[PDB]
């Protein structure tokens, strides 16, 4: 029943559901079948960085993903988020594995949201930055297999003692406080998110991916959303 | 049972419990009997601004209160907050009225918290800014008589339709997300808070005050904490 | 010879050079003949707010202008700033009067610029905020008739002792430090500017306007750029 | 003739001028003879981080220096900066070598300054962050042997082609824009600086150190200020 808007880092393409034949970054609006995609030259075992931006004037959701010493990949999609999401939402990170696997490690995550009203100097804002995750992270709602504190990192999916990633795993982390993305008097609403990740797999075909998402505040992991469903969607429709 | 650290803007001095004979700003550490106070030339009906700062290196809690076109009042107290408060806390605003009354209106509130670890570029941070309050403020926990949306403001205590403040009222507003003020690897922890208020009363002796406070995450208004207890303390001890 | 990109608040339309028949907001790219315009319901004597945003991924310059209690005006233009401006630029405010006049008062101005590289956590940033201007503002380059300190405000054009605006006046204020808007390794470059202004005139036809601009670092007021040229352009071509 | 306030990371103690017998961090107020010092367990070849903080209410300059996986060193000194420095200043980094040497590499540098007035919401601020230095850094004033762009870093002292540090070298980098640290209506003025450095030397006795400093805007490297004088002082008095 959840309303999901997500930017996915898809490591394992599922050609049967519309995905192109290569790893890619995509913009999902209420469906795992990305509205827009871009080729992503994913690097197994390297730390990458994803930047997501949006503003209510342009109504364009854009994302850039890069690795040090390499060219970046970019994808954009024209979408009015006020027509898709509710006034109050929660933001988070999600990841999954299935028959194929990979570590879905988050080393840092920052988010800034601003609502500027027509009143003079009337700016509402929220900003959080995690460069370090502790074992008891009270400002995060951890769902599924997600855990914090392992090396000061956030492990979205299960990783065994020896560091090996596990299959059929799903986990998400949402910021505790709801985020206001629309107000009747707002002249401009905008946000920017940044996260660094480490996707590693002993396999030649790692899976399934990581996604930054925005949802209704009471969002929970849908049943059997491991694998291609990224812990965000109930089905492949 | 709550653990309270507060900076109070005391409009009605209670000489019977140690308060000096004039309105004052004070620093309360687990007791309504301020550890330190400073004369405050309170102005009925004018908008004022309070700034509170602290850092774990200096271990000094300081606050400054001012009104436009006037000199400010300042108070400081040497206190190691790690020895008083738990690792995770919630921050908020509290106010009360008793036999004497006043409006306890908050027009804006900002807070910034930073935890810097010994790891290179390892900074965790939280920042929120409210310059406008809407009727349904989901990122705030409103307790007691506190309400939002009235003129885009936060009314900590009850105010009737005609704008007149009510007696025997108590209310608090806490930010939804818990705040991390200590971590084993932190080299410096600091915060700064700023809020603008409007205290107005048709009476010559307005009461009782507004306080910025930090407490255990599950803090609630103590029984019969109206009046001099500022919705923070269970007794005058 | 200067390279100018500007967002103008045009109070006096010059139909002879292409302007629509009403006050408007426009986006100027190296010419006073706006590439794009939008109707602006200017209010004589009221304080307004302008917000300008841009990012290198979307390559879209957008601006929103509003007044309290009123609907806002918005204008956007698709332009790659890297193809127009040099790597290093200076940002500022400009205003002019001619036969017709108005006060071109700036009460506040903020600017944030970010350059994010492909290196992990490699973010360069610049941010300044002026909510108050002092008589000797060393971090601003004042050109022409611009002065600071009058009521803690920045007066872009000459205003006499009695508060009356003067005709045939031109002035600009640029931030002292050059701003970096492009780097070979940058994956995303973005900026946002906000300023509050007070345009007042004893006349029914106030003139000429205020503009936020970006230019080459050594930019100076072109000869005879009073009136319609806004202290930015050498001619009306 | 310059007015200097500095926080030094002294790698080579000069017992003849008062320094303790070990590497240390010190707070210098117009003299190379530190007002206060603290033992610093310097690590040759490791990247460290220094944090400096101050505010006009407490009038206490504090600094913390740390390395990953190690305990930090801290030093504080009670000093009213308004009684030492002029209203407008420039901030920067300085370093030197003499008969003994070391690399004085800066990998990142951030600074935030705030001036809060008694007027409602009257906050002036300046913030810059360098996580990357380019060959032509126009927003920095480089003095002496200082250069940028080498590996995206700032080399305060001369380093040859093969990476070996050179002796008798001195260099400084100041932020281009002057910084306002006092205003007649300011109720609180504060700043915080953070920089990461890499001090490496092929020698067992590296020298001489790095210092974060604040000075009059027109400050220049004093004659023969190599070695123990850190490019900041004209003599050892």
From Swiss-Prot, chains A, B, C, D:
Ca(2+) binds at residues 10, 12, 14, 19, 208. A carbohydrate binds at residues 12, 99-100, 228. The keyword Metal-binding applies. It comes from the Eukaryota. Keywords: Calcium, Lectin, Manganese, Mannose-binding, Metal-binding, Toxin. Pfam families: Lectin_legB. PROSITE patterns: LECTIN_LEGUME_ALPHA, LECTIN_LEGUME_BETA. InterPro entries: ConA-like_dom_sf (IPR013320), Lectin_LegA_CS (IPR000985), Lectin_legB_Mn/Ca_BS (IPR019825), Legume_lectin_dom (IPR001220), Leguminous_Lectin (IPR050258). GO terms for molecular function: D-mannose binding; metal ion binding; toxin activity. Mn(2+) binds at residues 8, 10, 19, 24, 34. Belongs to the leguminous lectin family. Binds one manganese (or another transition metal) ion and one calcium ion. The metal ions are essential for the saccharide-binding and cell-agglutinating activities. Homotetramer. This is Concanavalin-Br. It comes from Canavalia brasiliensis (Brazilian jack bean).
């Amino acid at each position: 029943a959840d309303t999901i808007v997500a930017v996915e880092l898809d490591t394992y393409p599922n050609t049967d559901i519309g995905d192109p034949s290569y790893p890619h970054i995509g913009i999902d609006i209420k469906s795992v079948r990305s509205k827009k995609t871009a080729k992503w030259n994913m690097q197994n075992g390297k730390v990458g960085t994803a930047h997501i931006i949006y503003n209510s004037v342009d109504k364009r959701l854009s994302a850039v993903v890069s690795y040090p010493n390499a060219d970046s990949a970019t994808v954009s999609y024209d979408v009015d988020l006020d027509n898709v999401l509710p006034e109050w939402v929660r933001v988070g990170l999600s990841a999954s594995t299935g028959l194929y696997k990979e570590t879905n490690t988050i080393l840092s995550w920052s988010f800034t949201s601003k609502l500027k009203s027509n009143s003079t100097h009337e700016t509402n804002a929220l900003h959080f930055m995690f460069n370090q995750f502790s074992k008891d992270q009270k400002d995060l709602i951890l769902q599924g297999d997600a855990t914090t504190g392992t090396d000061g990192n956030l492990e979205l999916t299960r990783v065994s003692s020896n560091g090996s990633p596990q299959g059929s795993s799903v986990g998400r982390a949402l910021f505790y406080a709801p985020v206001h993305i629309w107000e009747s008097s707002a002249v401009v609403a905008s946000f920017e998110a940044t996260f660094t990740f480490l996707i590693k797999s002993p396999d030649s075909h790692p899976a399934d991916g990581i996604a930054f998402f925005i949802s209704n505040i009471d969002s929970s992991i849908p049943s059997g959303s491991t694998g291609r469903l990224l812990g965000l969607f109930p089905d492949a429709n």
